């Protein structure tokens, strides 16, 4: 029920209202729309206070009182119309991930490495 979620529902929620439009009247009128893209989701990490960012392992999350999340990324179509005519990738948040999901580092990792990952197999 999480692998289902991260894969599909996340996107279908975006695709519902990618678009929303603002039309400025002139004295020929303007019309501004903005629309989203397909959603991109990272492999989990932390923004440390200094500024540095880096991958994070579930173990270190527990003892740094961190949060096992991965970021989100979507495409933005900023555009304009003037009104009948039209003249990158965007961060949108951090998503915690159910452990042992495809997006978690561990959903593949080897049993031996689980020891090197200090996670009880």
């Amino acid at each position: 029920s999480f692998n289902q979620f991260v894969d599909y529902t996340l996107q279908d929620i975006i695709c519902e209202d990618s678009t929303l439009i603002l039309e400025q009247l002139a004295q020929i009128s303007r019309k501004y729309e903005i629309s989203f893209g397909k959603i991109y989701v990272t492999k989990p990490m932390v923004n440390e206070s200094d500024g540095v960012t880096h991958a994070l392992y579930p173990q270190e999350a527990r003892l740094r009182n961190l949060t096992y999340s991965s970021g989100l990324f979507v495409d933005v179509k900023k555009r304009t119309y003037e009104l009948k005519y039209e003249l990158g990738k965007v961060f949108i948040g951090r998503l915690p991930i159910m452990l042992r999901s495809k997006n978690c580092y561990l959903s593949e990792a080897t049993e031996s490495d689980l020891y090197k990952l200090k996670e009880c197999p």
């Binding site: 206070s49 200094d50 500024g51 540095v52 960012t53 880096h54």
Partner: protein, 138 residues
């Protein structure tokens, strides 16, 4: 200025270009505003910090950073007052410290990613192709 002070006080340091590329402020009235803001708290009473975050996006390992520190450390003390806007020399430190390495960090990559035309990178490294000799700790 209300945040750079906090940052400059939160032990983190950012260039003006940086928050300027967060907020357009034309930097001058700002520069005075920050100057006068500093002198405000003066009466209401460190170029290394950038290097980690610099290489942090560069996906580098710490040695080049640490090496860059002692390089940055050595350049300032002796001579070569080095940089006048010395985040320049902070960068050439990175580049020459990756000139210490074989790892792919073209100043072409550096400049477009650290936002300095490579001319000072050459020049910084230039006096440091001369000052590499006394820049051999390891």
């Amino acid at each position: 200025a209300s945040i750079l002070i906090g940052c400059r006080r939160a032990e983190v340091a950012r260039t003006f270009k940086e928050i300027q590329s967060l907020i357009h402020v034309k930097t001058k009235e700002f520069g005075k505003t920050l100057n006068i803001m500093k002198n405000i708290l003066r009466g209401k009473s460190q170029n290394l910090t950038y290097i980690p975050r610099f290489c942090s996006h560069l996906g580098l390992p710490m040695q080049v950073t640490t090496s860059a520190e002692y390089t940055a450390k050595k350049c300032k003390e002796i001579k070569e007052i080095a940089g006048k806007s010395p985040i320049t020399i902070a960068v050439v430190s990175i580049y020459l410290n990756i000139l210490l390495f074989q790892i792919p960090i073209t100043a072409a990559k550096v400049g477009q990613t650290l936002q300095v035309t490579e001319g000072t990178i050459k020049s910084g490294y230039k006096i440091l192709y001369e000052h590499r000799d006394k820049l051999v700790d390891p």
